[PDB]
């Protein structure tokens, strides 16, 4: 059971990281435009 909770926390962290990077890339393309 603790393994499932740790995996869920890792997945949430990775998803937040991916969203952050996507927003950064969007700002980069806006800057290039």
């Amino acid at each position: 059971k603790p393994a499932v909770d740790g995996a869920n926390f890792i997945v949430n962290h990775m998803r937040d990281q991916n969203n952050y990077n996507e927003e950064k890339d969007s700002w980069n393309r806006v800057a290039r435009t």
Partner: peptide
């Protein structure tokens, strides 16, 4: 001991990420 190793590894990774 495989389940204990898995639990310890995953808990360490989660703690480090936090």
């Amino acid at each position: 001991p495989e389940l204990r190793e898995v639990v310890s590894s995953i808990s360490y990774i989660a703690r480090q990420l936090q």
